[PDB]
């Protein structure tokens, strides 16, 4: 329901970019 | 500076969550 941490930070367009923080650039979400 | 990786990862609501990653020490939205 939320994204936060201190590792790898990736963002994706979505009305205002999306926030995904994860060790692996895996598909966090499909929506 | 701006949204970067390998530092601090933070996010905030804005129609679909926003992506804000920084090394802190600066005022970024702060919700």
């Amino acid at each position: 329901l939320r994204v936060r941490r201190t590792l790898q930070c990736s963002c994706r367009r979505v009305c205002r970019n999306t926030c995904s923080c994860i060790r692996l650039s895996r598909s966090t979400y499909a929506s």
Side-chain angles (χ1 to χ4, degrees), chain A:
Chain A
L1 202 70
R2 59 179 292 173
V3 187
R4 190 176 297 172
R5 249 286 145 187
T6 57
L7 30 127
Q8 234 180 311
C9 167
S10 298
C11 322
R12 141 169 290 178
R13 182 158 171 82
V14 63
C15 164
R16 229 80 171 178
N17 211 340
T18 0
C19 192
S20 298
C21 326
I22 29 58
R23 290 179 179 180
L24 301 177
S25 298
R26 67 187 182 278
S27 296
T28 300
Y29 64 90
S31 206

